[PDB]
RNA sequence: CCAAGUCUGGGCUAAGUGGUAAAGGAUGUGGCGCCGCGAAGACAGCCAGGAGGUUGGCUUAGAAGCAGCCAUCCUUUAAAGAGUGCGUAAUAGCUCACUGGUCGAGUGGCGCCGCGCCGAAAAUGAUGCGGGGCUUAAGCCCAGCGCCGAAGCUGCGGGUCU
RNA sequence: CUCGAUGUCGGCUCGUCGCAUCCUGGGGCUGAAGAAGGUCCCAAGGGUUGGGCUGUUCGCCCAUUAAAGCGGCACGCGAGC
RNA sequence: ACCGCUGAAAGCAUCUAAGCGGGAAGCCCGCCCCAAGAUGAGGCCUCCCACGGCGUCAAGCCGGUAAGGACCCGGGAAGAC
């Protein structure tokens, strides 16, 4: 969502690279981190 | 047929007389009120305050138009006049009674109510 | 069909660059180069963005038009022709070269095809 | 570096209006602090503020000391339009000479205050440098 | 010849059950000229004279079944088109000509207070100042009447021979009776 | 760094590795952009990079291989869950005939290779020959039929949970 | 395209960056220093208790880590967990911050960098100057080497003023 | 740049781009069950209505509607009114 | 966009660089409308045969072949001409 400025929720929410892209991931709809 | 401010009498008794045609009811564009159709106009004048009253925001339908209606029966029908009936959101008349005949139509687009009240449906 | 044997060449793998380059080189001077290979051809990795640029030849459509060929055949059309000008010789120099698909006479097959191949 | 008309004819002799220096707590060794590298008539206000919000998030022991302070100022629109411009003051600060000793998060073991200041940098404006002092930070 | 076609009979409606207007169409089997194939090399149109008597005054189903009637001797009666079907026909506009941006192209003209002023018919404008001269956009008095017109969802109702002729569902053949009609039921949707 | 137990006929040509076995008749591909590894009684990773990068590159193949095998011999199995207080299924035709409202259930076919099973209407699952080609299709239906975890019901990957 | 090394040497790119941008992010990638250990056989996997006086103070109608304001100590023992954590009405399960068997040889951390991807959306139609180019493609950094190219400088010869 | 001169507001017509998208599809989010809303990412195809009073645009009001979009181009257009 | 599968490097996970799929009124195709003057003038069938005399690579001057066309006339929802 935040497109710009993502940084680790749940004590897990991972750091993944898709299309060089960095989009938050972690066992929660409440983390759908993306930029 | 019948829009902007073309006028048309009553045949029911709702307590009216004649009514100005605001919008043709249906959805955007649309430019026409042909019997069966439903109009968004008001009172140009109504009896001595029956129940309606001059200049009353309104909702009425199509039943008399000298515009001539082509019956799927390659037939043709029209009238000496142009007017219709009021209604209760629920495509339901008010006039307790009818007046000049009308046309199958109505039925086809819901209204029986008048369909039969009518003195004669042509 | 069959022709001369003047400029007897082909293509495949190589670098879709200097490739044409000389093609003309002799494209100039005053020679005819009929080869072929298209597909086989070759050109920058980064396929992806690889097939992009030339899709930039793809839908580059300008009312006034702007076709932008859709078969290897072209790719080389452009490019090459690129090497030259547009007054006489050059021009002609564009009729004097000719290539084709598989083989009529004794990564370079994806962008095309891709955008038309 | 355009600066003002004089220290007592235009606008010189003020308090600049702000929120004093020291906070946090002592600490003999532990060198915990902050400085910069950017040049900028440090935005007073912005300034004053910032630092403060700093205390807002911590509270007590962590040299919430801070070695800054504006003392001159700009000016602009007031009068005719654009031409012969008189001057109407507003917004003093101080030159953050391309880096230098900012404020200090100084104390034994109290990073619970390092993070703070941290929060203090975040804020600020001109980027900022996160650092330690003689020894580091413990 | 890949298809089937002839000319405009005319229009009239009448009968049915609710009633419905169509159009008549003339055409037995206008013989069979070669047939489409690009085999061994380039092949398309031959001509083993067998035509009319005057014609030298000027001297894979669709096409396939053809082979059926085009080898028979030439001609080929029209009408698979049967009871309730959708071919498509391509008339020829109608020598209507060069007209004003009026009917040629829908548009509102000279309003009132000036909707007469010995004023009238004539488009509103072209292009702005900075944009650039002109567009190939806004049509123009783009002549009409000749266009190779046609359409779709062309449903045929019935047919009979007495003279091989066809009855149609809604005419609009484009061109006029005695006119050049060609039909098909292309990528039908009503299928 | 692995093995090739019983029957694992192995042929690595051009870059393709042909593995023949019991109920695991399979012909897979395998990079020429690296180093093959096979010796008739084992096999493993080849270092055509030795460097972190390609390192993993095969550090993947490894598995890759591992697949061919276990795949060629003991085919694979995906455990599915039929959790629907209305939905339900039980093979029919050479495919499956699931159901879950709407009106038109659906027939799904495991093209040559894949093969589904209706142990018992409620639950089901697939047994192919390539964990790869399996897990996928296996799921490609597990969803196919909305698992909607709004409060519990639908196709779900074995070993799920609930919600609120 | 247009004249001149698809020179050689050794690094760095895997985005077409080059071919405009900032604050701001992130086990991208390559090169440098630190804390703990792998035979108290180490981090991620897995077996288990997943310890007791801890169920303290404001508010309690409920702090009793898992409402929040203050504590942060003691322990009989395999050590501890000021119990960072999903919860519910507080309690009630799991999770390492705690370690045995099984493996077994490199595993997690911050400082220093040089290259690089999100932030970075526009109006006629598209853009490195164009065709174009991914270990001489070519870019960028550090090294040696030879060729181009002004009307500038040498050779040719005339001109002309002081 | 133009004063040896580029005729300026609103309207009319004829429109053409653009996307930060009003309607429209596709999505992830929700303190989302349904339904309907809110949040934000992807997409411009097509489309986005009659009146009123105002020189006006703007704007308020009337009846619609899925919707009744923001803005370019001399806030497009006078050798077209 | 957006959702997944198979699995490295991170012996545990990951839509992921490589391998394979899901998914839009949108792009390409498809549906109508031109259209090789696209100087790359395209295909194909159906007709016509080697005429005269002159210096030349006379690819230059004449009767021709209704193969054939035209012009003039008479006519067309073909149409300013």
Torsion of CA D106, D109, D114, D117, to 10 degrees: -40
Nearest CA in chain E to C64: E136
Kindly give, in sequence order, each residue whose CB lies less than 8 Å from that of residue B90, ignoring residues fewer than 6 positions away. none
Closest CA to B93 of B63, B61, B53, B57: B61
Contacts 24+ apart (CB under 8 A), E173-176: E173/E8, E173/E11, E173/E23, E173/E25, E173/E89, E173/E91, E174/E89, E174/E90, E174/E91, E174/E92, E174/E93, E174/E94, E174/E149, E174/E150, E175/E8, E175/E91, E175/E92, E175/E93, E175/E94, E175/E149, E176/E8, E176/E94
Please check whether residue E132 touches C, CB under 8 A: no
CB atoms within 10 A of CB F65: 28
Calculate how close chain E gets to C66, using CA atoms only, in Å: 15
E19 touching chain C per CB within 8 A: no
Distance B27 CA to H27 C1' (A): 29
CA distance C54 to C61: 13
Q: What is the dihedral of CA F66, F68, F70, F71, to 10 degrees?
A: 140
Q: Tell me the C-alpha to C-alpha distance, in Å, between residue B112 and each of B60, B84, B92, B108, C116.
A: 15, 14, 9, 9, 62
Note whether E54 contacts B: Cβ–Cβ < 8 A. no
In angstroms, the first-to-last Cα distance of chain C is 22
Residue B70 β-bridge partners: B76
**Residue C81 to residue B12: CA distance in whole angstroms:** 83
Spell out the residues 6+ positions from residue A27 whose beta carbon is closer than 8 angstroms to its own.
Answer: A10, A12
Helix%, strand%, coil% for chain F, nearest 5? 20, 30, 50
Q: Across-strand partners of B8?
A: B19
Same domain flag for F98 and F157:
yes
First to last CA, chain B: 20
- Best interface-test mutation with E: which of B72, B74, B104, B108 has the largest number of E CBs within 10 A? B74
β strands within chain F, DSSP E: 9-13, 16-20, 26-29, 78-83, 96-98, 106-108, 116-120, 123-126, 154-157
Any idea what the Cα angle at residue F159 is, between residues F156 and F161, rounded to 5°? 75
Domain boundary among the residues F51, F75, F99 is at: F75
Instruction: Tell how strand F123-126 and strand F78-83 pair up.
Output: antiparallel
Residue that finishes a domain, picked among F35, F54, F75: F75
- Residue D24 and residue D105: Cα distance in Å, rounded? 8
CA proximity to E157, closest of E169, E141, E142: E169
- Taking the CA of residue B59 and the C1' sugar atom of nucleotide H22, their distance in angstroms comes to 29
Could you tell me which of E173, E180, E177 has the C-alpha nearest to residue E151? Answer: E173
DSSP structure string for E129-186: SSS-S--S-S--S--BS------S-EEEEEEETTTTEEEESS---SS-TT---B----
Instruction: Quote the CA–CA distance of F127 and C8 in Å, as a whole number.
Output: 56
CB contacts, 8 Å: E133 with chain C: none
Find chains touching chain D: ≥3 CB pairs under 8 Å: none
Torsion of Cα atoms, D117 then D120 then D126 then D128, to 10°:
20
From F75, F101, F131, the end of a domain falls on F75
User: CA-to-CA distance for C105 and C96, rounded, in angstroms?
Assistant: 16
Yes or no: say if B22 and B106 are a contact pair by the CB < 8 Å rule: no
Burial B71-90, CB ≥16 within 10 A → b, else e: eeeeeeeebeebbbbbbeee
Helix F52-73 / helix F131-142 crossing angle, nearest 10 deg:
80
Number of residues that make up chain F: 164
Distance B52 CA to H11 C1' (A): 40
Give dist(CA F120, CA C25) in Å, integer: 74
CA dihedral F111, F114, F119, F125 (to 10 degrees): -120
- In F21-163, the DSSP E strands lie at 26-29, 78-83, 96-98, 106-108, 116-120, 123-126, 154-157
User: Hey, is the C-beta of E136 within 8 angstroms of any chain C C-beta?
Assistant: yes
Task: Write b or e for each residue in F83-119: b if 16 or more Cβ atoms lie within 10 A of its Cβ, otherwise e.
Answer: bbeebebeeeeeebebbbeeeebeebebeeebbbbbe
Indicate if F81 and F71 belong to the same structural domain. Answer: no
| Rounded Cα–Cα distance for residues C38 and D47 (Å) | 66
3-state secondary structure of F154: strand
Distance between CA E175 and CA E182 in Å, rounded? Answer: 11
The CA–CA distances, whole Å, from D128 to D24, D49, D123, E117 equal 20, 16, 9, 75
User: What does the radius of gyration of chain A's CA atoms come to, in whole angstroms?
Assistant: 9
* CATH for C1-117 (3.90.1180.10, 1.10.760.10, 3.20.10.10, 3.40.50.300): 3.90.1180.10
* DSSP result, B22-43: EEESSSSS-----TTSEEEEEE
Is the domain of F113 the same as that of F83?
yes
Taking C1' of I76 and every protein CA, the nearest residue is E95
Residue of chain E whose Cα is closest to the Cα of C63: E136
Q: Nearest-CA residue of chain E relative to C62?
A: E136
Strand-pairing partners, residue D130, are D34
Subunits touching C (CB < 8 Å, at least 3 pairs)? E
- Give Cα B55 to chain centroid, integer Å: 17
Residue E27: burial class (beta carbons within 10 Å; 0-12, 13-18, 19+):
buried
Q: Encoding tokens for residue B105?
A: 């139509």
Handedness of CA B60, B63, B65, B70 (dihedral sign): positive
Q: Are D16 and D61 in contact (CB under 8 A)?
A: no
Q: What was the elucidation method? A: X-ray
Whether residues F154 and F99 share a domain: the answer is yes
Tokens matching residue A25: 């991931």
Q: Give bridge partners of residue D65 from the DSSP assignment.
A: D104
| E37 Cα to chain C: minimum distance (Å) | 21
Cα–Cα distance, C32 to C99 (Å, whole number): 11
Long-range interactions of C15-21: CB distance < 8 A, separation 24+: C15/C42, C15/C43, C16/C41, C16/C42, C16/C43, C16/C75, C16/C76, C16/C79, C16/C108, C17/C43, C20/C76, C20/C79, C20/C80, C20/C82, C20/C83, C21/C83
Question: What is the distance between the alpha carbons of residues C94 and C83, in angstroms, rounded to a whole number?
Answer: 10
Q: Show the CA angle centred on residue F154, arms to residues F151 and F160, nearest 5°.
A: 70
Separation CA B13–CA C115 (nearest Å): 72
Find the largest Cα–Cα distance for chain F: 57
Q: Do F93 and F163 fall into the same domain?
A: yes
Which DSSP string do the residues of chain D spell out, in sequence order? ------TTTTS-S-------S--S----S--EEEE-----B--TTTTTTTHHHHHHHS-SSS--EE------B-----SSSSSS-------B--B-TTS-EEEE---SS-GGGHHHHHHHHHSSSS--EEEEBTTB--
Same domain, F105 and F25: no
CB distance from E40 to chain C under 8 Å? no
In sequence order, what DSSP letters do the residues of C40-92 get, joined into one string? G----S-HHHHHHHHHHHHS--BTTB-----STHHHHTHHHHHH----THHHH
- CA D10-D16-D17 angle, 5° bins: 140
Contact C22, C85 (CB under 8 A): no
Bridge partners of F76, per DSSP, are: none
SS3 C111: helix
Q: In chain E, which residue's Cα lies nearest the Cα of B73?
A: E18
- Cβ atoms of F160 and F81 closer than 8 Å: yes
Q: Are residues F123 and F141 in the same domain?
A: yes
Residues 6 or more apart whose Cβ sits within 8 Å of residue C78? C57, C69
> How many domains would you assign to chain F?
2
Asked whether the beta carbons of F117 and F129 are under 8 A apart, the reply is no
Residue D39 near residue D98 (C-beta atoms within 8 A): yes
Q: Which residue is nearest to nucleotide I22 (CA to C1')?
A: F140
Strand H nucleotides with an atom less than 7 Å from a protein beta carbon: 12-16, 28-30, 32-33, 39-41, 48-51, 62-68, 72-74, 76-77, 80-81
Chains that touch E (3 or more CB pairs under 8 A): B, C
Q: Mark whether F16 and F65 lie in a shared domain.
A: yes
Distance CA B14, CA B36 (A): 18
Residue B116 phi/psi, 5-degree rounding, is -100, -45
Q: Nearest nt to E131, CA vs C1'? A: H73
Smallest CA–CA separation between E132 and chain C, in Å?
14
* Cβ neighbours of E13 in B, within 8 Å: 74
Q: Do E13 and B74 touch (CB under 8 A)?
A: yes
- Provide, as residue numbers in chain E, all residues whose Cβ is less than 8 Å from the Cβ of C63: 135-136
* Chains C & E: contacts with CB separation below 8 Å: 3
B–E contact (≥3 CB pairs within 8 Å)?
A: yes
- Is the CB of residue F81 less than 8 Å from the CB of residue F123? yes
Tokens of B7: 């006028």
Alpha-carbon separation of residue D92 from D11, D16, D42, D65, E59 (angstroms): 10, 7, 8, 21, 100
Question: Within this chain, do residues F82 and F120 fall inside the same structural domain, yes or no?
Answer: yes
Distance between CA atoms of residues F130 and F132, nearest Å: 5
Angstrom distance (rounded) from CA E12 to CA E25: 12
Q: Is F125 helix (H, G, I), strand (E, B) or coil?
A: strand
- ∠D49-D51-D55 over CA atoms, to 5°? 105
Nearest to E32 by CA among E65, E59, E55, E80: E65
**SS3 of residue F101 by DSSP:** coil
| Dihedral (Cα; D106, D107, D109, D110), 10-degree rounding | -70
Whole-angstrom Cα distance, residue E5 to residue D121?
84
Question: Could you identify the residue written with the tokens 């039980």?
Answer: F90
- The structure tokens listed for D40 are 């900028």
In terms of domains, do F35 and F82 share one? Answer: no
Taking contacts as CB-CB distances below 8 angstroms, the residues of chain E near C64 are 136
Residue D87 CA, chain-centre distance (Å), reads 26
By C1' distance from the Cα of A8, the closest nucleotide is G26
Helix H or strand E segment including F131: helix F131-142
Residue B72 near chain E (CB below 8 Å): yes
**Domains of chain B with CATH codes:** 1-122 (2.40.150.20)
Shared domain check, F80 and F70:
no
Chain E residues 6-35 with a CB less than 8 Å from chain B: 13, 18-19
Half-sphere exposure of D105 (CA within 13 A, CB side): 29
Contact between residue A17 and residue A8 where contact means Cβ atoms under 8 Å apart: no
Contact residues, chain C, for E135 at CB < 8 Å: 63
Q: Which domain holds residue F104?
A: 76-164
What DSSP letter does each residue of D11-24 carry, written as one string?
S-S-------S--S
Q: How many CB atoms lie within 10 A of CB B118?
A: 23
List the CATH number of the domain containing F95. 3.90.930.12
With contacts defined as CB-CB under 8 Å, which chain B residues touch E19?
72-74
Query: C90 — phi, psi (to 5°)?
Result: -30, -85
Q: Is residue D49 within 8 Å of D113, Cβ to Cβ?
A: no
Which residues have Cβ atoms closer than 7 angstroms to strand H? A 1, 3, 29-30, 32; B 4, 22-23, 25-29, 40, 57; E 105-109, 111, 114, 117, 119, 123-131, 135, 137-138; F 150
Q: CA-CA distance, B24 to F57, in Å (whole number)? A: 70
| E136 contact residues in C (CB cutoff 8 A) | 63-64
Q: What is the 3-state secondary structure (H, E, C) of E47-104?
A: CCCCCCCCHHHCCCHHHHHHHHHHCCCCCCCCCCCCCCEEECCCCCCCCCECCCCCCC
Q: Which residues contact A15 (CB under 8 A, 6 or more apart)?
A: A8, A22, A24, A25
| Burial of D102 per CB tally in 10 Å (0-12, 13-18, 19+) | buried
Are residues F69 and F47 part of one domain?
Answer: yes
CB contact set of F33 (below 8 Å; sequence gap of 6+): F48
């Amino acid at each position: 969502k935040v497109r710009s400025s993502v940084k680790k929720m749940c004590d897990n929410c991972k750091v993944v690279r898709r299309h060089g892209r960095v989009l938050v991931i972690c066992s929660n709809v409440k983390h759908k981190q993306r930029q | 047929m019948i829009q902007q401010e073309s006028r048309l009498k009553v045949a029911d008794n709702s307590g009216a007389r004649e009514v100005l045609v605001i919008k043709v009811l249906g959805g955007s564009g649309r430019r026409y009120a042909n019997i069966g159709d439903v109009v968004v106009a008001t009172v140009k004048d109504a009896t001595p305050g029956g129940v309606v009253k001059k200049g009353q925001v309104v909702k009425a339908v199509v039943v008399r138009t000298k515009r001539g209606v082509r019956r799927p029966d390659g037939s043709y029908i029209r009238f000496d006049e142009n007017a219709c009936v009021i209604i209760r959101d629920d495509k339901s008349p008010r006039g307790t009674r009818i007046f000049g005949p009308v046309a199958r139509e109505l039925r086809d687009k819901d209204f029986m109510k008048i369909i039969s009240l009518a003195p004669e449906v042509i | 069909a069959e022709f001369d044997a003047d400029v007897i060449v082909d293509a495949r793998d190589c670098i879709m660059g200097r490739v044409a380059s000389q093609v003309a080189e002799q494209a100039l001077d005053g020679e005819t180069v009929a080869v072929v290979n298209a597909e086989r051809a070759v050109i920058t990795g980064r396929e992806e963005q690889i097939v992009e640029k030339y899709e930039k030849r793809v839908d580059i459509g300008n009312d006034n038009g702007y076709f932008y060929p859709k078969r290897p055949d072209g790719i080389f059309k452009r490019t090459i022709r690129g090497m030259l000008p547009k007054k006489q010789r050059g021009r002609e120099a564009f009729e004097s070269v000719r290539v084709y698909l598989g083989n009529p006479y004794d990564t370079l097959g994806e962008i095309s095809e891709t955008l038309g191949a | 570096s355009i600066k003002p008309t004089r220290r007592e004819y235009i606008s010189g002799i003020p308090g600049k209006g702000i929120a004093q220096f020291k906070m946090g707590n002592n600490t003999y060794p532990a060198q915990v602090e902050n400085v910069v590298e950017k040049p900028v008539q440090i935005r007073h206000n912005a300034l004053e503020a910032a630092r403060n919000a700093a205390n807002r998030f911590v509270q007590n022991s962590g040299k919430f000391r801070i070695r800054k302070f504006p003392f001159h100022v700009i000016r602009e629109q007031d009068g005719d339009g654009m031409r012969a411009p008189f001057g109407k003051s507003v917004g003093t600060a101080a030159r953050s000479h391309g880096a230098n000793h900012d404020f200090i998060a100084w104390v034994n073991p109290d990073p619970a205050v390092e993070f703070a200041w941290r929060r203090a940098y975040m804020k600020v404006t001109p980027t900022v440098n996160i650092d330690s002092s003689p020894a580091g930070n413990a | 010849v890949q298809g089937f076609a002839g000319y405009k009979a005319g229009m009239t409606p009448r009968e049915g059950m609710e009633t419905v207007p169509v159009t008549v169409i003339e055409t037995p089997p206008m013989r069979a000229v070669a047939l489409r194939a690009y085999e061994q090399r380039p092949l398309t149109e031959v001509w083993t004279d067998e035509f009319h008597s005057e014609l030298d005054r000027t001297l894979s189903d669709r096409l396939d079944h053809a082979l059926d009637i085009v080898e028979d001797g030439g001609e080929h009666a029209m009408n698979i088109f049967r009871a309730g079907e959708y071919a498509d026909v391509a008339g020829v506009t109608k020598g209507k000509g060069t007209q004003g941006p009026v009917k040629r192209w829908g548009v509102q003209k000279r309003k009132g207070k000036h909707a007469r002023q010995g004023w009238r018919r004539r488009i509103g404008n072209l292009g702005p100042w900075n944009p650039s001269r002109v567009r190939s956009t806004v049509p123009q008095q783009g002549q009409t009447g000749y266009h190779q017109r046609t359409e779709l969802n062309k449903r045929l109702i019935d047919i009979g021979e007495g003279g091989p002729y066809t009855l149609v569902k809604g005419s609009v053949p484009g061109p006029d009776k005695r006119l050049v009609p060609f039909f098909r039921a292309v990528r039908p949707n009503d299928q | 760094p692995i093995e090739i137990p019983a029957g694992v006929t192995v042929t690595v040509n051009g870059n393709t590795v042909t593995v023949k076995g019991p109920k695991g008749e399979l012909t897979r591909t395998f990079h020429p952009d690296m180093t093959i590894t096979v010796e008739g009684n084992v096999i493993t990773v080849t270092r055509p990079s030795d460097e972190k990068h390609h390192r993993a590159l095969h550090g993947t193949t490894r598995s890759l291989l591992a697949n061919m095998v276990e795949g060629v011999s003991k085919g694979y199995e995906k455990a599915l869950e039929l959790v629907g207080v209305g939905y339900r299924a039980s093979k029919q035709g050479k495919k499956l005939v699931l159901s879950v409202g709407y009106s038109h259930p659906v027939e799904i076919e495991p093209e040559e290779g894949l093969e589904i099973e209706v142990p018992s209407q409620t639950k089901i699952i697939v047994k192919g020959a390539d964990k790869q080609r399996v897990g996928e299709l296996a799921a490609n239906i597990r969803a196919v039929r909305p698992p909607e975890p709004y409060k519990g019901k639908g196709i779900r990957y074995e070993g799920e949970l609930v919600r609120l």
